[PDB]
Amino acid sequence: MKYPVEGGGNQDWWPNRLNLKVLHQNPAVADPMGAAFDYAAEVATIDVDALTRDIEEVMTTSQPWWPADYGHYGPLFIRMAWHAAGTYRIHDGRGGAGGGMQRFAPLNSWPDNASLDKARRLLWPVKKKYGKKLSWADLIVFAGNCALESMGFKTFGFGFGRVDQWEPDEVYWGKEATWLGDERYSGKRDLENPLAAVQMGLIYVNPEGPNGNPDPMAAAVDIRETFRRMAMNDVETAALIVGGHTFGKTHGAGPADLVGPEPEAAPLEQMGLGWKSSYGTGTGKDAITSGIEVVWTNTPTKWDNSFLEILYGYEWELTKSPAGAWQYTAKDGAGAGTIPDPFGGPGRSPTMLATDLSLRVDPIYERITRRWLEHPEELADEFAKAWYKLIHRDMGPVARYLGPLVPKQTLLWQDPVPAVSHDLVGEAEIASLKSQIRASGLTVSQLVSTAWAAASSFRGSDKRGGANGGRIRLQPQVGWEVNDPDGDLRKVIRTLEEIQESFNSAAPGNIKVSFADLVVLGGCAAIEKAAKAAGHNITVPFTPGRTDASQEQTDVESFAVLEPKADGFRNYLGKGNPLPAEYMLLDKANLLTLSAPEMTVLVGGLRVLGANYKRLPLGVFTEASESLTNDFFVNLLDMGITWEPSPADDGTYQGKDGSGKVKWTGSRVDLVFGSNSELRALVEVYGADDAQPKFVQDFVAAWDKVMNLDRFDVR
Amino acid sequence: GHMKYPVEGGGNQDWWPNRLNLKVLHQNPAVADPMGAAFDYAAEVATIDVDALTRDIEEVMTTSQPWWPADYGHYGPLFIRMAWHAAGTYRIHDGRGGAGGGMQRFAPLNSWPDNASLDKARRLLWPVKKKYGKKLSWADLIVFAGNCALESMGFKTFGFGFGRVDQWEPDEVYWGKEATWLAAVQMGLIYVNPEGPNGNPDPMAAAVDIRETFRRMAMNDVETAALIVGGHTFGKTHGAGPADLVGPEPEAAPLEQMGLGWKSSYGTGTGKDAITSGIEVVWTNTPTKWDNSFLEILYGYEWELTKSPAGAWQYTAKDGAGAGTIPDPFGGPGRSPTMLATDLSLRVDPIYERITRRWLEHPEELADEFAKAWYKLIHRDMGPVARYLGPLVPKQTLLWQDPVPAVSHDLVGEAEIASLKSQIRASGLTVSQLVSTAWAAASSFRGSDKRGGANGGRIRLQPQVGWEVNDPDGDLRKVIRTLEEIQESFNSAAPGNIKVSFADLVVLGGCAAIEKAAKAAGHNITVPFTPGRTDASQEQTDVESFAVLEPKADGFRNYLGKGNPLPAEYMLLDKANLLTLSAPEMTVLVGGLRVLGANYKRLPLGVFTEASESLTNDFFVNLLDMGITWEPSPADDGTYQGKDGSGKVKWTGSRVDLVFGSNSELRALVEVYGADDAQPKFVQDFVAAWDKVMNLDRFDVR
Ligand code: HEM
Ligand code: HEM
Structure with missing residues (x-):
């Protein structure tokens, strides 16, 4: 059977045909905000104190359709926040919170995104007040950050500027046709290159060990691999897992067969909400989200060093969730009735998740956590840094961070570039430099290839790489196979450095040129020389302002994923x-x-x-x-x-x-x-x-667009 | 192994296969157009030289190519078949199809079984398209090639109108739910199976399929017979060898073929060994000149089932009956007369038989009917006659075009509009009445074939005034009467020759109601209004052709x-x-x-x-x-x-x-x-959308 247009179409006759519709994603016609909406100018003027007050009022106010545990929706907002940013992946930079795809992409219906529709719905009173001055992508992560702030944790900072999108970003999540599929491994734990999740629909890891096997060692291996595929090392992974599970609880009160379909396959009357449970009231004391019933800490709405004390204070035998899931509980009934109930009543025995014993059983995590057991300040600092990295991974250069909460210092994972320390060339020195470049003896091919190699490392997903930074002469990029370090990219680089030295040593006043600017300028000069040879007199636009990063400011391992295969x-x-x-x-x-x-x-x-x-x-x-x-x-x-x-x-x-x-x-x-x-x-x-x-002018427009892809300090 | 990459068609439809696909609303975006945003095709093709354009197409037709040798030396019949396959996909019930966008060159259509060997036809025209570039679109060129082919072989056509804008992504259209290539449901064919219903070679049973499929594209019996008789007066059918030797369609063909498909491995694969449909019929003894020889042959012999070399039902003359009187495309022995299985329908069928026998003695009527039918065929989804461009548009109008009178008076502006709005509001009509009437007038427009809309003032005429959605036996007649009273009150007391038409009053009352509602809400705005609409009469409105525009x-x-x-x-x-x-x-x-x-x-x-x-x-x-x-x-x-x-x-x-x-x-x-x-923002956006909808059919101001 085939479906007319709004059910399906041309991909049915030839399922593996070249799909060009990916090249016009998020068209301006589908944008309800017009072609004059500059989000940065809007979000640069919001009142963060009032926004914080509104978010706190929302967190501390329970709502009949989703009763708040412990009278606080903070932990739910934290979970939503990192699940928004937990889909990032260093393979191609797609995923993450930079687009707010948690609303209508093929997640919003992932098994791990259960009960997050209610979390996003609870924030409508905040988005209603600010409207277009605050995007959904910004609000989703800011809610979690403000929850952390309100529950006693001093975070590193925050940066606004995540532009909303009005069309699901088509991202390849796996070849498994059914939820929780595990067709992405070969031999041992050797997760396939494009993916960064253990199963389909799972954000990071099945909370029962691999494929439902409650083994702390194998679960630790899976955690390590999954977090490694998202730019997190052992220390950051341990900090994130310990800090995140300090707050809140799990929801496994009743059997999972009583839970309705996902939001994308739900009746109309539910208003986009899904997983409607028929057990008890279906919400509150009878909520079912993952099937596990675990409260990690006896103070789940405050920040303290109690997760690790509980983790290392008991023996953690294996028992079963009331919904039929695997979980650990303190042996010999130790500390019974010491964990408070979300909605008042009897206490609970201390319970740990199957992947939480990994932090004390795996030797690496064991050493890290045992260090943090008696040194909570190290845990606080590590969690703050890891959370900041997690939220702002796919947001790009530091020039894109807006608002007054942006921290002042730079971090190596941001690929920092130094600020402009001189005066930029303009409209005369540019002409002189282009003359010198065309008289330097470098061929059109060398200049064009060098400029393209410098500029064609940008990813539109996480906005890493690009021509800025002058990193084509630095170690990770100067040695890539596609760049051919053998036959060129050394004569060219040496000649460009000689030209830059000669110009800077004789330029008038305090006007200098950086190496990256000179690379792009050489590319443009070659383009216009070739166009003149064709028979057209044109001028390729050039926007100065690039600066040269150093080797110590470039992370070799972080750049290994930008190498084009x-x-x-x-x-x-x-x-x-x-x-x-x-x-x-x-x-x-x-x-x-x-x-x-x-x-x-x-x-x-x-x-x-x-x-x-x-x-x-x-x-x-x-x-x-x-x-x-x-x-x-x-x-x-x-x-x-x-x-x-x-x-x-x-x-x-x-x-x-x-x-x-x-x-x-x-x-x-x-x-x-x-x-x-x-x-x-x-x-x-x-x-x-x-x-x-027409071809020449179109090529020049495209070339200028590509060269200026990463220029967020002038756009 | 499911859930492919999004670059090869993966997406949300693989998880939930019956969800709302909003991508049909941002179809053909401006970012995919290589011509830019300032491209005005109507101002480009208007400066074309048709005399130089026909001169190139003629020398293209009369120049054989080594990769697709030409039959009898002329590529004319192939171009006629291409031009009609372009326009033969029109569907009255939704307007999709036709040669409006030139979709025959894109993935759904270019790989249909009936469109075999048409990938070669569209490529022989590249030298013509290369000369003109943006001054001539592919959609215009595809039909102009067929028109000039008709003209070149002695047939005087009615006329031609340029103005088909190329689109840069295939238009998603529901052609049927079968999931297998090739009635209760429509197959992957254009009109009918050439061998009869479901391959049954009975011509009487094929007549009903021909009638139904042609009626579903606004062709009656006279126009159906004329199209078939005229189209099959030229050319031949290619069935020289078995069909198992034909390669894949263009969308499944390898990269060596450069977008060409159906590569044959029989003999040379082209020319004398071409295999397109597998029937191998040559209808007329002069397949490259227009004459009254199709009907002479059809009524001159008695016919008989045989099989083509590929294996396919076809009719040949009984007991020889003049063997060798039909020349072959490339010099060789003659052939006996041969007719398609659906061409006998025009003979053994009570309705078609009288028409064809009438034309057998009066070929002038056949020529006139074929000219009119061809002109209607290649211009179904152009829209209003104001969209026709070039120095070839016929002067006199036709009923199927939904003609409206030309503006024969001065237009109101900015001073009578203000006064007209002031008495529409003070006429007793509520905001709901005016808005509903204005929306009913202008919601009949469909952008596929650009039919309907507010222009013409047809909301008060017989087909639309009686639609269930328009008047549930209610206010529509009262609103129409009040608007007409306002019209004849304003027209009499006019400053000079300034006058207003009924359709203009309908749209203007809608706009005045919008302004009144916005002022009630607390916003002071002005809904833009572009006068120029005229009023059609009942005789200029075809009731039967408007029945398909009724919203279900x-x-x-x-x-x-x-x-x-x-x-x-x-x-x-x-x-x-x-x-x-x-x-x-x-x-x-x-x-x-x-x-x-x-x-x-x-x-x-x-x-x-x-x-x-x-x-x-x-x-x-x-x-x-x-x-x-x-x-x-x-x-x-x-x-x-x-x-x-x-x-x-x-x-x-x-x-x-x-x-x-x-x-x-x-x-x-x-x-x-x-x-x-x-x-x-909501008020401004609603006003912009309302003005956009009100001016959908206004092609006379663009
Ligand atoms: C940055 C890392 C993490 C953070 C910030 C975090 C934070 C949280 C928080 C605050 C909750 C409580 C939600 C609520 O009370 O409504 C939660 C629940 C949960 N977490 Fe995480 N966590 C992290 C990592 C992980 C990992 C690695 C797993 C591996 C399985 C995991 C599995 C779960 C599960 C199954 C729940 C239960 C949710 C429910 O039942 O409603 N989390 N997380
Ligand atoms: C029920 C109606 C029709 C049927 C079943 C039909 C079927 C066919 C078939 C099977 C062929 C063979 C093509 C090949 O093997 O290469 C053909 C050829 C052709 N058809 Fe039709 N057709 C119909 C109507 C028309 C109309 C309406 C026109 C033009 C207005 C037309 C013009 C032509 C021409 C010119 C050729 C010759 C192709 C060539 O010489 O390469 N036909 N037709």
Whole structure:
């Protein structure tokens, strides 16, 4: 069967066809805020004291549709807050709280996101007051941060500026067709590269050990691997788990078969709420969220060093949750009736979750926690730093943090860049520098490839990398395989440093130029020289302001995830990619926040400009040496050429003319633009007889967009 | 192994396969357009040189290509088949299909079994498209190639009108639910199976399928017979070899083929060995010249079932009957006469037979009917005649175009509009009446074929005035009479030659009601108004052709008829897509029309405000209230009642009303206009959307 349009569509006949709809995600037509809504200018003016008062009033006020445990919705807001930021993953930077996707993405219905719909609904009275001055993404994490502040914990700081989105970001979470699927492992615990979760729908880890096996060692291994795949080491992981579970409790009062469907498969009358329980009242003393009934600490609404005292004070035999789940309880009934009830009444025995004994059984976590057992100040500092890192991972450079709560110091995981310490070049020194660069003896190909390598490391997901920082001469990026440290990127870098030294030593006044600015300027000078060679007199815009980071300010391991395993624009293909070359090219274009016409012009320009990996002729459908001409598209649509795969199986094709002599050679990413019906439509726009000026100006616009992707200090 | 990557089609539809897909509302965004935002195609094609354009197409047709050799040397019949396959997907019941957007070059259509060998046809035209570029769209070129092919082989066509704008992503259209390529349900074919119903070679049974499928695209018996007789006067059918040697369709073909599909491994694979459908029929002895030889052959011999070399039912002349009188595309022996299984329908069928026998002696009538039918075919979804461009548009108008009179007087502006608004408000008509009438006039528009709308003043004419959604035997006649009284009162006391038309008064009364409601709510605004509409008469309105425009479900008026295929939620998004509205525009329109009182039969279903006839955002603030517990009505009416904190029913709503508070994507938009200090934004957005809807069919001012 097939569904008309609003149920399904074209992906049914050909399930594995190239999907170009990912390149126009979040269109401005679907934005209800108009094309003049500058979120930064709005959120820069809110009153944080009033917002804190409103959030505290919401936390301390119980609501009939979701009775508050202990008369406080703080712990629920903390859980919501990190579950928003717990979907981040360093593989590609997707996920996290930077987009507020917890509302309508394919989560909002994940088994671990149970009872978080009520948490987001409880904050409507706050969002109602501030409207557009405060986004949902900002409010979700600020609610948890303010809950931590109100429950006695002094946090590091906070930064506003997470722009809302009005369309689910299509993120690959796994190949498992059913919830809690475990088809993402090979041999031992070897979680597949794209994913960062043990199962499907689980944020971090099943709270029963691997696949329901209540073994603290294996659970510890899973915790370590899962947190490692989200930029967290052992100390930060232990701090996060200890601090987070200091507050609140779990909800496993009744059997889980009485819980209704998820919000996305719920009746209309529920108003977008899901998991409606039929046990008892269904809320409050009879709430069911995960099936485990554990209260870790005897003061679950205050911050103190009581989680570790309880953890190391008992023996933790194994028992069963009243909903039928695995959990640990203090042996010999020690400390019975010492844990208070959420809604008044009898006490509880001390219970620990199956993954909470990992912190005292695994040797690494055991040493860390035993250190924190008698040194609560270290735990407080570590938790503050880890929480700050967790909330602001995918928010980008420090220039994007708004509001008055931003901390003053810099952290290495932010990829800090130094502030501008001189006066920027403008409109005359730029011309002189471009003249010097074009007279420096570097070819168009070298400059263009160096500029693209510097700038095409940006990810639109977590806004890491980019041309700012001048990090292409630093160790992680100067040695990448795609960058070819052998044949180039050393002559170019040395020449650019010589030019920078010569200019700075003689520039008037206190005007200097940074290395990154000079790299981008050389790229632009090469572009305009090639355009002049083609026959067009144009000027590539340049925005100075970049600064040079140092080696000590660059984390080599943190940058290892930005290395491209496949760069279709440079016609480079590494090893171990999950998909063919064209799909990887679309993924790269989506990461660069490009559209389809922009991708087309960038590919067609970089092909003829000589910015190919190893300067290979794969895709150079031109006879002009380094001229920004309209030749890639003209020769791609020519049917005087018959394409057929190379006799030596390489993933490369050769195009023979009418005389049978091989004229062109190409790859998957070169022929996909002439084969795909949606892409050939764009290629035919620039392949027309009168499209060379339009192609040149479009290429310059796309190039300037790519160079300025990471310029958040001027935008 | 399920749950593929989002880059290869993964997404939320894999988890919940029957959820509201809001991506149909942001379809074909401006960011995917390579031409930019300042591109005006109407100002580009108007400067084209048709004389130089026909000169290129002719030398393209008369120049064989090594990769697709030409049959008899001319590529004309192939272009005729392509042009009609482009326009042959039109559907009257929703307007989707046709050559309006040139979707034949995109994924759904370019890989249909009937569109075989048409990927080669669209590529032979690349040299023409290369010369002109943005001055000539693919959609315009595809049909102009067929028109110029008809002209080149001796047929004088009616005319041609440019103006089809290219779109850059395939249009999602429901072609049927079969999940297998190739009646109770419609298969993957264009009109009918060439071998008869379900492969049964009976021509009498194929006649009824032809009649039904052509009637479902606004063609009667005379136009159906003329189209088939004229189209099959040219060209031949390609069935030279078995069909198992044909490769995959273009969407499943490898990259070597550069977007071409159906690569044949039989013989050379092209030309003398071409395999497209597998029937191998040459209808006429002069397949590259227009003449009255199709009907002469059809009525000149007796026919007989045989099989094509590929294996397929076809008719050949009895006992020889002039073998070798039909030339083959590439020099060789002649062939005996041969007719398709659906071409005998025009002979053995009581209705078609009389028409074809009449044309057998009067070919001039056949030529005239074919010209008219072809012109109607390639211009079904152009819309109003004001959208035709180029120096080839015929002067005289046609009934199927929904003609309206030209403006024959001075237009009101900015001084009579103010006075007209002042007496519409003081005429006794309530805000609900005016708003409902204005919405009823302008909601008939559908953006697929650009039919209907406020222009023409057809809300008072026979088809629309009697629609169930329009007047539940109520105010519509009273509003129409009052507006006409105002019209004849204003026209007599006019300053000079300034006069106003009835449709203009309908839209202006809607705008005046909006202004009155906004002033009641506390905002002083002005709804933009662009005069220029005219009034059509009853004879210029075809009652039967307007019957398909009747809304079976209007989510904005909270009306649900009978015979809808999907629940009320999905039909609302379908109509919003037909009105070319985005999700915020749909949201503001739904939230504003409820409090204005535009509900069908003035029902309280979804009126979440206490003081009606006032343009507030009370719908959104009362939808997001969590003090209201929604639960289905005791009677299975499909309505829900939301009780207060006590056991008192505070509000009542329907599926369309409650889906905005339930769908997570739609609730995001509701929380924008439902927030505090968000009422001025809501008023401005509602006014912008209302003005956009009022001016949907105004192609005479663009
Ligand atoms: C940054 C790390 C973490 C933080 C900040 C955190 C915080 C919290 C808080 C405050 C609660 C109480 C919710 C409430 O009382 O409504 C909670 C519940 C819970 N946590 Fe975490 N936790 C973290 C890590 C983990 C990990 C690694 C697991 C592994 C299984 C886990 C599993 C659970 C479960 C199953 C619940 C029960 C929720 C319910 O039943 O309603 N958490 N968490
Ligand atoms: C019930 C109606 C029709 C049926 C079943 C039908 C079927 C067919 C089939 C099966 C072919 C063979 C194509 C191939 O094998 O390459 C064909 C060819 C053709 N058709 Fe139709 N057709 C119909 C109506 C029309 C109409 C309305 C037109 C034009 C207005 C038309 C114009 C043509 C032309 C010109 C060709 C020749 C193609 C060529 O020479 O390459 N046909 N038709």
